Design a protein around this ligand. Structure first.
Ligand SMILES: CN(Cc1ccc(Cl)c(Cl)c1)c1ccc(S(N)(=O)=O)cn1
Ligand SMILES: CN(Cc1ccc(Cl)c(Cl)c1)c1ccc(S(N)(=O)=O)cn1
Lengths: 304, 304
């Protein structure tokens, strides 16, 4: 028992992290097979980042201008291409540590692990969620660009995020591994305000189920509600609307705890309306929304 | 910027995790060089765990009774010995993935990463603290015993914890890699109540410094205090007494933010007395105590 914000074991991804330098910009790349994926802004200088013309900047760059270092061994770059906001550097050596992998684009409210890296070297691993406004709340210093987000299903790493920037507001934006930004963000040093950071209702409900399953029961009440009634309260509190699809996804946890999803919604409704009154749930004084229903089942069932 | 509860990258430790089976008990072992370390309770059956005589139980066990599996390959056990509460299984093969490593016994308030494992296979990684009552608040299901806690300094893994049990109260107890329990706990299914789970003051202060450094400034006040005055309030709130050693340890963060340690203590004092008033610090509604001053500097400086 006990419930922790758990990341995937990072080893399979550690074995893919390299350093990419172009001129005076160093950041991280992802080495899978004979391709290194990195943010295209690696080609950008100081004055370039205000309104960079990536096509024009890239013309001035040859394969030999991209310095790719794996540990303390240099990889030979035999090709480069820009796909959306990422560069693909073809190297002459397949990464011998390439895991089974996929590139997935995740939906807002889905969670993933980040392996924060500097100079192609891992600093730490943490779990976060794609926010409903398509930001993530990360831990990224200068040099962390090209750090990746991922999920693992047994031995298959699904890469879903590559870090590109911290926005003016101290929140983070990046791309899938096809180089498409999540949300409306662009790889340019400009005004980029995020939308409302709404709470991922279905995740809160999952986490309340985790709380029940690990003994924190105090917030269970005598009430029920309907989706429509609950959603009136969700709206008021900047919670994502709950859909029948979310109810279906919570079916497993509903079954286990024998608590109907709508009864848990009524518990969440009272918590929203009444607050915690100085009490805690799974060591938190706020309602946690970076566990998916799948995460709660995975952690409660001990999948490896 | 941004501040996350970050674990060490787990790869170096993933490469050390094996499965140990004795009779009908399966749990995890740590394979370093030609030794596998695992909880001694691996030899215990259903009725054994109420008051096991480990010396007597171990007499009935031979090397061939300890089944050690690394991935899906069996290791040959050429010796076994009990050291305190761990078994050391000598195998005929050095772990080719053995990292540089040390065994350290940590002090309460020190943090470490856990790699939660089942059947010698990694499920997830998370950061926790040795509590002042020598428990940890983990995420451990049946089969997770022998999962380890560790810190990394560059390429050296310092192993500090091996999981042995969840106590009646839903909190966790284990040993250093010499097999000595943290705190008064024993590897026996008996009444084992934990002491007061006090808050790690020096860690809270570190985390308030992290908050300032990443822009959450609202709790900074016009006041100062003394260690003695602060400690009167700490006592009242089940916070660990703050010592001059803790002040010295916070010197780096004091310097950076230009906020004196005693001024930050006065901020913490008001937060204790007044509460958060529904506000948050680094996305938390309670004062976080599982970051050490060293952790805050490491994360804020991007050590790999
Ligand atoms: C935190 N960070 C790096 C940084 C900033 C200031 C200093 Cl003093 C240092 Cl050492 C490093 C950035 C960099 C660009 C942007 S942006 N896209 O809004 O211009 C935001 N954040
Ligand atoms: C949570 N856990 C395993 C468990 C418990 C009950 C069930 Cl239903 C299942 Cl599936 C698994 C244990 C096991 C022993 C103890 S102790 N040392 O206090 O007796 C505490 N917790």
């Amino acid at each position: 028992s006990g419930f922790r914000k758990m990341a995937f074991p990072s080893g399979k991804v550690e074995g893919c992290m390299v350093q990419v330098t172009c001129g005076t910009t160093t950041l991280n790349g992802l080495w899978l097979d004979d391709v290194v994926y990195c943010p295209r802004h690696v080609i950008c200088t100081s004055e370039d980042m205000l309104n960079p013309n990536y096509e024009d900047l890239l013309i001035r760059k040859s394969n030999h201008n991209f310095l790719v270092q794996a540990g303390n061994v240099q990889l030979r770059v035999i090709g480069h291409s820009m796909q959306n906001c990422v560069l693909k550097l073809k190297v002459d050596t397949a990464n011998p540590k390439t895991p089974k992998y996929k590139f997935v684009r995740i939906q807002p409210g889905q969670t993933f692990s980040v392996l924060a890296c500097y100079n192609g070297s891992p600093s730490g691993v943490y779990q976060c969620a794609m926010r409903p406004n398509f930001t993530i709340k990360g831990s990224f210093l200068n040099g962390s660009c090209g750090s990746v987000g991922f999920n693992i299903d047994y031995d298959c790493v699904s890469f879903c995020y590559m870090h590109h920037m911290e926005l003016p507001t101290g929140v983070h934006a990046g791309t899938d591994l096809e180089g498409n930004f999540y949300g409306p963000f662009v790889d340019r040093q400009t005004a980029q305000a995020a939308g409302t950071d709404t709470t991922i209702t279905v995740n809160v409900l999952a986490w309340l189920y985790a709380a029940v399953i690990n003994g924190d029961r105090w917030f269970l009440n005598r009430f029920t509600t309907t989706l429509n009634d609950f959603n009136l309260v969700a709206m008021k509190y900047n919670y994502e609307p709950l859909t029948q699809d979310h109810v279906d996804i919570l079916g497993p946890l509903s079954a286990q705890t024998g608590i109907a999803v709508l009864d848990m919604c009524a518990s969440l409704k009272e918590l929203l309306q009444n607050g915690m009154n100085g009490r805690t749930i799974l060591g938190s004084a706020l309602l946690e929304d970076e566990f998916t229903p799948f995460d709660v089942v995975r952690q409660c069932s001990g999948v490896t």
